[PDB]
Scaffold this motif. Sequence first.
Motif, PDB file in Angstrom:
ATOM      1  N   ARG A 115      -3.101   7.812   6.127  1.00 11.03           N
ATOM      2  CA  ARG A 115      -3.797   8.586   4.890  1.00 11.03           C
ATOM      3  C   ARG A 115      -2.751   7.973   3.704  1.00 11.03           C
ATOM      4  N   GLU A 116      -1.595   8.267   3.783  1.00  9.24           N
ATOM      5  CA  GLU A 116      -0.887   7.707   2.851  1.00  9.24           C
ATOM      6  C   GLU A 116      -0.741   6.065   2.603  1.00  9.24           C
ATOM      7  N   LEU A 117      -0.805   5.425   3.660  1.00  6.38           N
ATOM      8  CA  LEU A 117      -1.020   3.900   3.801  1.00  6.38           C
ATOM      9  C   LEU A 117      -2.225   3.546   2.721  1.00  6.38           C
ATOM     10  N   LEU A 118      -3.254   4.475   2.970  1.00  3.71           N
ATOM     11  CA  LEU A 118      -4.528   4.281   2.040  1.00  3.71           C
ATOM     12  C   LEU A 118      -4.578   4.326   0.720  1.00  3.71           C
ATOM     13  N   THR A 119      -3.683   5.555   0.535  1.00  2.00           N
ATOM     14  CA  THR A 119      -3.644   5.823  -1.016  1.00  2.00           C
ATOM     15  C   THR A 119      -2.692   4.586  -1.445  1.00  2.00           C
ATOM     16  N   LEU A 120      -1.884   4.064  -0.951  1.00  2.00           N
ATOM     17  CA  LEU A 120      -1.189   2.748  -1.398  1.00  2.00           C
ATOM     18  C   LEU A 120      -2.301   1.733  -1.675  1.00  2.00           C
ATOM     19  N   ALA A 121      -3.055   1.478  -0.879  1.00  2.00           N
ATOM     20  CA  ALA A 121      -4.073   0.397  -1.191  1.00  2.00           C
ATOM     21  C   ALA A 121      -4.971   0.852  -2.593  1.00  2.00           C
ATOM     22  N   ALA A 122      -5.473   2.006  -2.581  1.00  2.00           N
ATOM     23  CA  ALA A 122      -5.954   2.599  -3.668  1.00  2.00           C
ATOM     24  C   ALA A 122      -5.134   2.483  -5.107  1.00  2.00           C
ATOM     25  N   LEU A 123      -4.007   2.846  -5.002  1.00  2.00           N
ATOM     26  CA  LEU A 123      -3.037   2.862  -6.255  1.00  2.00           C
ATOM     27  C   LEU A 123      -2.688   1.487  -6.269  1.00  2.00           C
ATOM     28  N   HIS A 144       4.058   7.488  -3.771  1.00  2.00           N
ATOM     29  CA  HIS A 144       3.565   7.581  -2.492  1.00  2.00           C
ATOM     30  C   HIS A 144       4.352   6.629  -1.276  1.00  2.00           C
ATOM     31  N   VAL A 145       5.003   5.818  -2.110  1.00  2.00           N
ATOM     32  CA  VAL A 145       5.845   4.898  -1.217  1.00  2.00           C
ATOM     33  C   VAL A 145       6.686   5.657  -0.314  1.00  2.00           C
ATOM     34  N   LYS A 162       8.962  -0.057   6.259  1.00  2.00           N
ATOM     35  CA  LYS A 162       9.130  -1.003   4.979  1.00  2.00           C
ATOM     36  C   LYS A 162       8.103  -2.144   5.127  1.00  2.00           C
ATOM     37  N   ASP A 163       8.304  -3.020   6.276  1.00  2.00           N
ATOM     38  CA  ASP A 163       7.400  -4.005   6.361  1.00  2.00           C
ATOM     39  C   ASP A 163       5.944  -3.652   6.525  1.00  2.00           C
ATOM     40  N   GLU A 164       5.778  -2.605   6.876  1.00  2.00           N
ATOM     41  CA  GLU A 164       4.406  -1.926   7.137  1.00  2.00           C
ATOM     42  C   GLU A 164       3.670  -1.860   5.867  1.00  2.00           C
ATOM     43  N   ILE A 165       4.736  -0.909   4.826  1.00  2.00           N
ATOM     44  CA  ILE A 165       4.168  -0.598   3.525  1.00  2.00           C
ATOM     45  C   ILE A 165       3.873  -1.822   2.765  1.00  2.00           C
ATOM     46  N   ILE A 166       4.716  -2.890   2.691  1.00  2.00           N
ATOM     47  CA  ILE A 166       4.675  -4.143   2.065  1.00  2.00           C
ATOM     48  C   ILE A 166       3.162  -4.966   2.595  1.00  2.00           C
ATOM     49  N   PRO A 220      -2.247 -10.614  -8.892  1.00  2.00           N
ATOM     50  CA  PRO A 220      -1.575  -9.924  -9.886  1.00  2.00           C
ATOM     51  C   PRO A 220      -1.152  -8.419  -9.495  1.00  2.00           C
ATOM     52  N   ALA A 221      -2.259  -7.888  -8.842  1.00  2.00           N
ATOM     53  CA  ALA A 221      -2.061  -6.252  -8.431  1.00  2.00           C
ATOM     54  C   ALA A 221      -1.039  -6.298  -7.377  1.00  2.00           C
ATOM     55  N   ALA A 222      -1.181  -7.152  -6.270  1.00  2.00           N
ATOM     56  CA  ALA A 222      -0.124  -7.116  -5.316  1.00  2.00           C
ATOM     57  C   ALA A 222       1.036  -7.176  -5.553  1.00  2.00           C
ATOM     58  N   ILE A 223       1.575  -8.410  -6.415  1.00  2.00           N
ATOM     59  CA  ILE A 223       2.773  -8.344  -6.882  1.00  2.00           C
ATOM     60  C   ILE A 223       3.414  -7.306  -7.751  1.00  2.00           C
ATOM     61  N   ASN A 224       2.498  -6.688  -8.430  1.00  2.00           N
ATOM     62  CA  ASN A 224       2.901  -5.609  -9.368  1.00  2.00           C
ATOM     63  C   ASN A 224       3.252  -4.420  -8.351  1.00  2.00           C
ATOM     64  N   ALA A 225       2.717  -4.070  -7.184  1.00  2.00           N
ATOM     65  CA  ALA A 225       2.848  -3.342  -6.162  1.00  2.00           C
ATOM     66  C   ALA A 225       4.026  -3.454  -5.334  1.00  2.00           C
ATOM     67  N   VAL A 226       4.407  -4.565  -5.082  1.00  2.00           N
ATOM     68  CA  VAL A 226       5.599  -4.934  -4.388  1.00  2.00           C
ATOM     69  C   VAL A 226       6.973  -4.662  -5.086  1.00  2.00           C
ATOM     70  N   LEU A 227       6.790  -5.226  -6.354  1.00  3.55           N
ATOM     71  CA  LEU A 227       7.862  -4.836  -7.052  1.00  3.55           C
ATOM     72  C   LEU A 227       8.050  -3.336  -7.433  1.00  3.55           C
ATOM     73  N   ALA A 228       7.100  -2.718  -7.888  1.00  2.00           N
ATOM     74  CA  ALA A 228       7.471  -1.247  -7.636  1.00  2.00           C
ATOM     75  C   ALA A 228       7.918  -0.515  -6.466  1.00  2.00           C
ATOM     76  N   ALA A 229       7.502  -1.299  -5.415  1.00  2.00           N
ATOM     77  CA  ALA A 229       7.932  -0.737  -4.084  1.00  2.00           C
ATOM     78  C   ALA A 229       9.472  -1.280  -3.819  1.00  2.00           C
ATOM     79  N   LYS A 230       9.929  -2.439  -4.258  1.00  2.00           N
ATOM     80  CA  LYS A 230      11.133  -2.592  -4.125  1.00  2.00           C
ATOM     81  C   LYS A 230      12.243  -1.487  -4.651  1.00  2.00           C
ATOM     82  N   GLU A 231      11.826  -1.124  -6.029  1.00  2.00           N
ATOM     83  CA  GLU A 231      12.445  -0.260  -6.655  1.00  2.00           C
ATOM     84  C   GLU A 231      12.855   0.972  -5.917  1.00  2.00           C
ATOM     85  N   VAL A 232      11.692   1.640  -5.110  1.00  2.00           N
ATOM     86  CA  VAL A 232      11.997   2.860  -4.468  1.00  2.00           C
ATOM     87  C   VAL A 232      12.610   2.348  -3.359  1.00  2.00           C
TER      88      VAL A 232
END
Lengths: 120, 122, 120, 120, 119, 118
Positions: free
Chosen positions: F55-63, F75-76, F86-90, F103-115
């Motif tokens: 479920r959470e993994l799906l929220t990630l996709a959506a967000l 949600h990360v 981590k490797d799963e989340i990315i 552009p959307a993928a790159i913007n989500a990875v950086l956001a994830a690296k932060e957390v």
Amino acid sequence: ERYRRGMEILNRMNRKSYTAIRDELEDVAPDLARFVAEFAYGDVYSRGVLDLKTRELLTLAALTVLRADDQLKSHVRGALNAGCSKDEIIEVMIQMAVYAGFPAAINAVLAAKEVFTEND
Amino acid sequence: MERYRRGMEILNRMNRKSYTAIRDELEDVAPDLARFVAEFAYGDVYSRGVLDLKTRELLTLAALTVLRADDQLKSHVRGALNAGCSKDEIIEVMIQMAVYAGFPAAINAVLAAKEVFTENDP
Amino acid sequence: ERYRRGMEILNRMNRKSYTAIRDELEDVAPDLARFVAEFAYGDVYSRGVLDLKTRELLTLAALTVLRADDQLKSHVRGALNAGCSKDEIIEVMIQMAVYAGFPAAINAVLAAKEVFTEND
Amino acid sequence: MERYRRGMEILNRMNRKSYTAIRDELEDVAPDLARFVAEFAYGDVYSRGVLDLKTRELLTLAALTVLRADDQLKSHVRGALNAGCSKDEIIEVMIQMAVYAGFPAAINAVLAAKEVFTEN
Amino acid sequence: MERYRRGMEILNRMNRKSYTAIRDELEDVAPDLARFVAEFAYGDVYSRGVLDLKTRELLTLAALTVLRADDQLKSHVRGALNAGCSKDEIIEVMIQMAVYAGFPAAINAVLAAKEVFTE
Amino acid sequence: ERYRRGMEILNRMNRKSYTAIRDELEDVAPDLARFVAEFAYGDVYSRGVLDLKTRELLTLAALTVLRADDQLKSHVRGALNAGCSKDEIIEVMIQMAVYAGFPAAINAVLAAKEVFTE
């Protein structure tokens, strides 16, 4: 469940629609149709810092940006029944060309036309 | 031509501070853009008459919530507060937007509202 | 393999709007970093039916709607280095207010401003 | 009003067909939404001349692909063509969009263009 | 030429209806784009296995529901059921999209799913 | 009530974040953080035919498509807190390059690296 509430609201503003909505309430998600009543109209619309005519218009604005044809269409009737004129329903779709852009406005309008036209 | 004003007495009324703030892109590029604002947005669309100004600053916010346009959001929050809209109202349209544009959107915009709702409190 | 056929293209147009994005990135998730090199610039850009200076504008257009601020800046520096005039760049952002709305264009020009003025 | 004719000048030579279809909505919505396009869109924006009309056509294309608008994209592919843009060039902007907007968007734009291309 | 066949192999094996569709739009244009979908989309990124096969199929459906791509959505549902995803599962992800993307996105998607569940 | 369920999941999987209720408190929009617990969690995440990690993994996709940064981040955590590696989340973000663009993928990875870097 005070789901009876959201219903008291739907049957007097957009009854034909939610009735058709349940024509999805069957091999899929009737829980979804359910939610679109105890939380959508029975937990958000229920309250009231804004008139019902207003809320139906704000919805139009949202559905125009999203380009949600079918949902938008359905809400136009809702607004009419609520007490809005075609003049208002369109002035908001025109104001949308400014924030969502022209194609968005063009589409929403062409959509509300259909609803308008089929009273005969 | 000149009607610019037909939509300016408006602008300079509600959100003057704002139009001013943007006249400050008067260099980095075409004033021509800030022109089209007052000259088309407020020039021919807002001037129209079937919906009250309060009702329009409330309909602008909704769209901006869906688009998640943060900056333009805070802006029209001032503009809305200015025309007469109260807190309870601005925040009502946002809460309503969780239903149509998703929770992440209604939350993101409310917070931007909470900020603007702070001028000289501190 | 021909990873260079890609990187031997990105090392021109945008040498840091890359060098860098191969670091706040390929430090933990490098499937993506290769793909961008291999597929975007390697298979897609390396195509030649549209001028280089054109492809950069079309991308600036795409990111305007999407509100891709960071990737937009990165693609402004690249439009410049490709040989595009600030005029041209600003133009596309103007034509975007029509097909994507005023907030999109206002937000994109503000981003081009920064890059425009990077050194005092 | 050399701000109606002006845009209309561009209009009744490039996008001859679907503009006419602005009368196809002249009744519901004030001729306003159909007027603003000519006035604002093509008389205040497209009228500028720092970018070739051809270059301007592929641009609207880029944006309309991302927006997933199908009608407007369809009628702009007609324009793109009329202004001189070859089929190969049109399709090219959409292959480019798969990278920036995603494959679903690109696939969706090319199928609609096929319509304009298949015998219209 | 390498990954191209890998991509088409997968497509053919588990979504033959979408396979043929690619052959009926490869013509207008893209052998170049239809190439990239076979080459990059499937045999390059989809064939990666850090995520359960089932999971990698629901994500695709989550994404498409938010973008309102009614066309790609019916096709991926087909390939979702083909991957072992129960109908219960397909509808659950769409019901969840109502929260992060809004009711209109879910309602829209579910109705799309409905057409497919009716062969 | 129901909200007792929502929280049953919230204070479990992502309590540190959900306590952003504190932020809506000042009568701005409190009523909002409530709907989150009693609808998003009490009525949707609770009816689990799908595993939580999915479920959470799906929220990630959506967000990721929505480019919702301040939210993707929250949600990360919620994802890592459920066992997601981590490797799963990315991963979900890498696939999103195909469906929502690079552009959307790159913007989500950086956001994830932060957390991932707290």
